[PDB]
Design a protein around this ligand. Structure first.
Ligand SMILES: Nc1nccc2c1ncn2[C@@H]1O[C@H](CO)[C@@H](O)[C@H]1O
Ligand SMILES: Nc1nccc2c1ncn2[C@@H]1O[C@H](CO)[C@@H](O)[C@H]1O
Ligand SMILES: [Ca+2]
Ligand SMILES: [Ca+2]
Ligand code: NI
Lengths: 314, 315
């Protein structure tokens, strides 16, 4: 098992990624998670992270891990539209089974004392072995760590598996002020993304929309979790995916098993200018620019099977 | 003991909570049928969710199967929506996709597919031995269609219509550039049908308008209490649906289950049908001898909340 820290934005797929990571203890040792008040009010995201962790901890061999609320603030907020859906998960019956909430309530205080970014920095730097950061939300936190600790931080990162950007496909940020070339996580904080993608000595695996677009949330598959209602994770996963792509889940799946996707190096830069394409992750020919390993043609079935099986961990 | 009920719904989250309330209370309600209207949510999804909930309950609490029909009703005022926080989603909810339940649904889906919902409402009501209570949680298009088509032959077989809709003394919830916000969505979706129903003499109507439904909001701590009943499919179902959310329709269904949910006051209700800012508003009319509608007032919130929590333990 390799150390993994989940740096997420608290949206539905962030939690599916969390489930994926957490449930695969053979491959992943989830030593921490941080939630950014991005796709949600860090509040609900933080709580759901904890409720999921506790549900898992009380039902399978998943060690408790610190959970930090990131202090990162958006450059460009996620649409209020979806965004705060963690609020809705916070209230799902599956995440409010008494023994689990009882645990969360007991360990909540210890977690409330963490500042997400510093926790990310500490978890990575103080780990004996290198840490794989699964970033399913904006890059504000990994960027903060780099800005603050440079190499002391990046050298301790096995690799940063990032869900974000759109390299050779359209983005998904369609607003009156944008040209749709940017992807949401990058668009949330382009500057931090620039820092991360341009950081040499930081191995980055990038699950841009190029790969995530090829593995959409399909009804028949989601209904298969109904075949596993005896498993809490299936009720959990099935329920989340049954709400308004497996972006983050795909990203986390890779962390569990890189067979999820081949990756090809691409020098990725980010447009941080308040321009229509703000947040666009673009190929750059600038010499010696750091390479990012963009996932390509993910193994949809492999991933879909992985998720279904992982959803049986408990 | 148990009275015949037909649920005429719109397939949103509370329509289903309403269905669970009706279906789960077999001592008081014999659910003999349901129809889904393509209002709030895509009727096919509402149809499937209704079937899946029905079969889940058939298999787990012996809920007798009943016909489910999709209404052909088309909106007068389309929900600018798409933001239907249910039906589609719900159809993929794992608790509703348990094989034995889905298998049963698949076995009876074809037959239900053949029903045109409005005609079904008419037949269920008219061919029933005892009177039928129609719990309408969606627009009134189907009750109106039956009234217009069969008149007295239909209404005389209705025990009463317990309707979720309208706003009498409070603001509505239809806030569009062209509206004044005094209309409530179920009525606004089809004002003429609503007018038809509210002005129909010899049709008893109980009306849960926003006046009463606003007093029972869906609160997180309450929704979270379903997490304490996860050994019950209905609590996973209800909790899950309310986790995505007022208890408009649930309240209305609750009243069908036990009228102590709310006292009702007779009000002559007309519906603004003209294309005015308040189109769809349910207003008191001074028309002489105009039919009375019994508007729910100050519902028993705790009674309702307890009822729903209890009902969600039916299985
Ligand atoms: N409906 C939606 N469209 C686009 C992005 C969305 C979304 N719901 C959540 N996101 C968030 O941003 C990232 C992908 O663009 C994912 O990490 C994701 O979780
Ligand atoms: N977000 C929302 N706003 C207004 C009405 C809504 C709604 N979601 C569902 N409705 C529906 O319409 C009626 C209350 O206006 C109820 O039947 C209800 O289920
Ligand atoms: Ca995310
Ligand atoms: Ca309704
Ligand atoms: Ni069909």
């Amino acid at each position: 098992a390799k150390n993994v820290v989940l740096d997420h934005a608290g949206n539905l797929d962030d939690f599916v990624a969390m489930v994926l990571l957490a449930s695969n203890t053979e491959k992943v040792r989830l030593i921490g998670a941080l939630c950014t008040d991005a796709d949600c009010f860090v509040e609900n995201g933080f709580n759901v992270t904890g409720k999921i962790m506790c549900l898992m901890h009380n039902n399978m061999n998943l060690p408790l891990f610190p959970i930090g609320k990131s202090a990162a603030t958006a450059v460009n907020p996620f649409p209020k539209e979806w965004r705060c859906l963690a609020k809705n998960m916070d209230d799902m019956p599956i995440l409010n089974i008494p023994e689990n909430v009882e645990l969360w309530d007991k360990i909540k205080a210890e977690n409330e004392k963490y500042e997400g970014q510093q926790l990310l920095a500490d978890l990575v730097m103080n780990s004996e072995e290198k840490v794989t950061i699964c970033v399913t939300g904006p890059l504000s936190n990994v960027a903060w760590c780099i800005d603050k600790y440079g190499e002391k931080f990046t050298s301790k990162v096995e690799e940063c598996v990032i869900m974000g950007g759109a390299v050779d496909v359209r983005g998904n940020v369609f607003l009156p002020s944008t040209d749709g070339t940017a992807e949401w996580n990058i668009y949330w904080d382009p500057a931090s993304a620039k820092t991360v993608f341009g950081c040499p000595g930081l191995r980055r695996i990038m699950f841009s929309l190029d790969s995530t677009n090829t593995v959409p949330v399909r009804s028949p598959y989601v209904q298969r979790f109904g075949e596993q209602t005896n498993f809490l994770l299936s009720i959990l996963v099935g329920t989340m995916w049954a709400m308004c792509y497996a972006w983050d889940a795909l990203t986390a799946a890779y962390v569990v098993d890189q067979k999820v996707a081949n990756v090809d190096p691409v020098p990725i830069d980010v447009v941080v200018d308040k321009q229509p394409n703000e947040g666009a992750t673009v190929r750059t020919d600038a010499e010696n620019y750091p390479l990012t390993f963009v996932a390509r043609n993910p193994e949809a079935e492999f991933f879909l099977d992985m998720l279904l099986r992982s959803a049986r961990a408990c």
